[PDB]
């Protein structure tokens, strides 16, 4: 169920094996979520939090996201995306690396 106004959780009270998930971030840092065991009847106040990583959009998804419409943006973007597994990062700046250090 894709719930948009957040109203369908109350409807499933009493049925076993239900899962309720909230998209985004917790408003308070010290917020810990409670889990439920298999086979139990669902009760409310059992939820979770989740975020979508950017890696799960794909090459085509990111290209459709950025939308280059100029002279030489597409080939540069494609070359940058094709070489994303050979880049290293240490907390302030991006650097390349050979096998010899």
């Amino acid at each position: 169920i894709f719930d948009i106004n957040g109203e369908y959780a109350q409807a499933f009270t009493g049925i076993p094996n239900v899962k309720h998930t909230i998209l985004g971030e917790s408003p308070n840092v010290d917020s810990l979520e409670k889990k439920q065991q298999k086979g139990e009847l669902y009760s409310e106040e059992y939820y979770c939090y989740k975020k979508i990583p950017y890696q799960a959009l794909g090459f085509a998804g990111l290209i459709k996201l950025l939308r280059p419409s100029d002279k030489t943006q597409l080939p540069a973007l494609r070359n940058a995306l094709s070489a994303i597994n050979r880049t290293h990062f240490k907390s302030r700046n991006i650097y390349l690396e050979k096998d010899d250090g």
Binding site: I4, E7, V18, L23, G61
Partner: protein, 197 residues
């Protein structure tokens, strides 16, 4: 590395293949804190990912699934698609669902803003009261199994009554629906309660 990312993101949301272990039977996804400029893109991307993974799984490795969509006219059509060659989201999902056991439920209050190809894939129709005329005209254009004497009385239906026709019904009926217990809650506040403080 590109494959496994979405390959596990799809499994987190929609479930695992046949024969694996799945914790839950009902999964509720809540989207209350999300802007309206970002919903179309993210939801379209999720549905395209589901379609692709469903194709890759095949028939032997698929499980019958039911997907419920609320207010589908907000994100099923692409605003940046004024040309007909940019809408490739719903058709693939509908075909792959008809083929690989994935049925869809579409709820909306503005059927005239929905693509006419979307509304011609359905086999059964449930219709409560509709008031605007261009909404009646978009439904008169795409139905297959009705008649003109049943579309006359839609405009005057009281609250809680519907009109049902399709392949599951031998002849069209006017029906009084039962009450859900317990039902859903309300998503709106009341000013007089706050101002009373």
């Amino acid at each position: 590395h590109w494959d496994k990312a979405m390959s596990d993101e799809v499994d987190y949301f929609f479930g695992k293949e046949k024969g694996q272990e799945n914790d839950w039977n009902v999964h509720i996804v809540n989207m209350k804190n999300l802007a309206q400029d970002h919903a179309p893109m993210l939801l379209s991307a999720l549905l395209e990912m589901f379609a692709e993974i469903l194709f890759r799984r095949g028939q032997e490795r698929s499980y019958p699934t039911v997907l419920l969509l609320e207010e589908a006219h907000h994100y099923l059509r692409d605003p940046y698609a004024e040309i007909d060659s940019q809408i490739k989201a719903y058709e693939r999902l509908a075909k792959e669902g008809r083929k690989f056991k994935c049925s869809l439920i579409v709820s909306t209050q503005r059927p005239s803003e929905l693509s006419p190809t979307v509304l011609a894939m359905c086999s059964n129709w449930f219709s409560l009261r509709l008031t605007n005329e261009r909404d009646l005209q978009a439904l008169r254009y795409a139905m297959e199994s009705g008649n003109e004497q049943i579309l006359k009385q839609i405009s005057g239906l009281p609250r809680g009554d519907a009109v049902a026709f399709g392949s599951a019904f031998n002849l069209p009926v006017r029906i009084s629906i039962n009450q859900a217990r317990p039902g859903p809650k309300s998503s709106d506040a009341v000013f007089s309660e706050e101002w009373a403080n």
